Ligand binder design. Structure first.
Ligand SMILES: O=C(c1cncc2ccccc12)N1CCN(c2cccc(Cl)c2)C(=O)C1
Ligand SMILES: O=C(c1cncc2ccccc12)N1CCN(c2cccc(Cl)c2)C(=O)C1
Lengths: 304, 304
């Protein structure tokens, strides 16, 4: 028992982190096979970041201007290209520590682990969700650009995020490993609207099921509701509308607890309408939405 | 910016996890150099765990009865001994992945990362604190015994905890790497009182400093307090008394924010007396106490 914001073990990703320097700028790169992936803004100077013409900026750069260092050893850059907002630096050596990997674009509401890195060296690992507004509420300081988000399926690492930017609001924006930004964000030092951030309803319900499995059952009531009645309540509280696909995904959790999804919805409705009254659920005084139904089942079944 | 419950990157520890089997019991072991460390209750059967005589039980066991597997390969056991509540199984092969390490007994209120493991395979990593009542609020299922807690200082791994037991209350108890239990717990399936769990005051203050650095400043007030006046309030709310050693440790955080420790104490006093009023601090609706002053400075400075 117990419920914690658990991240995947980070070893397979630590062995991929390198430091990339271009001109005066240093950030992190991801070395997989003979390619180092990094944010393209590594080629920018502070005077360029207001409105950079990356194509023109990249033209003034040659292979030898990209310094890639893996631990203490320098990697030889034999090719460079820009794919959307990432640079791909071809090196002459395949990373011997390259795990089995995939590049995936995650859906909003899905979770992933972030290995925060500085100067190509890992500093920490934490779990987070891609928000419905395509931002992440990470923990990143200067030099963390190029740090990646990932998921692990047994031996395969699915990389889903590369850190690029911190918005003036303190939230983070970045790309998938093909360089496509999640959300409407651009790699430009300009004011950018993140958008209204709603609560991931299917995840809150999964976490309520986790609470029931863990003995926290005070919030359970004698009521039920309908998908449409529940969604009227969810709209008022900026919660994502619950669909039958969401109810289907909560099936194993509903079966394990013997609590119908709509009965749990009625408990959530009452919690939204009445608050916690100073009580806690799984050590929290607010409704947690960064655990998917898969995460709850994983943490409650022990998949390694 | 951003503040997350960050764990150390787990790679150095993942390379140390092995599976230990004895009779019908399987749990995790920690392989460092030519020694595998594991909870001694691996030698027990379910009929023995009510009141086991470990010395008598261990007598019926020989080297060949301890099955140690590192990934897919079997390790040859050439020696076995009991040190307090851990067994040390000498194997004929030094772990080639042994990092620079130390065994340390942590103080209550200190934090550490846990690499939860099953069948010698890592499943997740999370950060936690040793509670003042010497329990940990972890996330562990059947088969997680032998999973370890650690800290990383650049390249050196300081192992501080080995998981042994889940109390009937859902909290966890275990030992340091010399087999000495944290707290009064015994490795016996008997009812054991955890004791009153107080709040780590120095950690809550560190987290309030983290909040101020991150822009969350609503809780700051026009008041100050004294150590004795504050401690009267801390006693009422089951908070650890704040000492001048604690004030000294908050020095760098006080200097970075320009907020005197006693002024932050007065903010904490008002938060204890008045509650949050439905507001949040660093995305939380309760006062967080599992971040030490060192953790706050580390997460706000980027030590790799
Ligand atoms: O290194 C960071 C950085 C990253 N993450 C969190 C931080 C918190 C405090 C200070 C700096 C950071 N930068 C530089 C690049 N940079 C940027 C600016 C404009 C566009 C692009 Cl693509 C990128 C940043 O936003 C900020
Ligand atoms: O494997 C676990 C275990 C571990 N952690 C969390 C769990 C959550 C659900 C079910 C089982 C566990 N056990 C077996 C040993 N065991 C024990 C019983 C008495 C004494 C000793 Cl030292 C140990 C346990 O407490 C429980």
């Amino acid at each position: 028992s117990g419920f914690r914001k658990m991240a995947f073990p980070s070893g397979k990703v630590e062995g991929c982190m390198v430091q990339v320097t271009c001109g005066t700028t240093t950030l992190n790169g991801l070395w997989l096979d003979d390619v180092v992936y990094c944010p393209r803004h590594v080629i920018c100077t502070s005077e360029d970041m207001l409105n950079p013409n990356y194509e023109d900026l990249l033209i003034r750069k040659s292979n030898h201007n990209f310094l890639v260092q893996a631990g203490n050893v320098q990697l030889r850059v034999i090719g460079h290209s820009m794919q959307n907002c990432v640079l791909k630096l071809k090196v002459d050596t395949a990373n011997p520590k390259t795990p089995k990997y995939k590049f995936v674009r995650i859906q909003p509401g899905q979770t992933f682990s972030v290995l925060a890195c500085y100067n190509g060296s890992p500093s920490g690992v934490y779990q987070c969700a891609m928000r419905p507004n395509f931002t992440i509420k990470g923990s990143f300081l200067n030099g963390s650009c190029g740090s990646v988000g990932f998921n692990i399926d047994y031996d395969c690492v699915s990389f889903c995020y590369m850190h690029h930017m911190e918005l003036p609001t303190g939230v983070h924006a970045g790309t998938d490993l093909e360089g496509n930004f999640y959300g409407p964000f651009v790699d430009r030092q300009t004011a950018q609207a993140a958008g209204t951030d709603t609560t991931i309803t299917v995840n809150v319900l999964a976490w309520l099921y986790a609470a029931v499995i863990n003995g926290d059952r005070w919030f359970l009531n004698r009521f039920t509701t309908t998908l449409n009645d529940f969604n009227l309540v969810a709209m008022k509280y900026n919660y994502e509308p619950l669909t039958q696909d969401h109810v289907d995904i909560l099936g194993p959790l509903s079966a394990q607890t013997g609590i119908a999804v709509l009965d749990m919805c009625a408990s959530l409705k009452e919690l939204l309408q009445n608050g916690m009254n100073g009580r806690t659920i799984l050590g929290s005084a607010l409704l947690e939405d960064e655990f998917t139904p898969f995460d709850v089942v994983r943490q409650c079944s022990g998949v390694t």
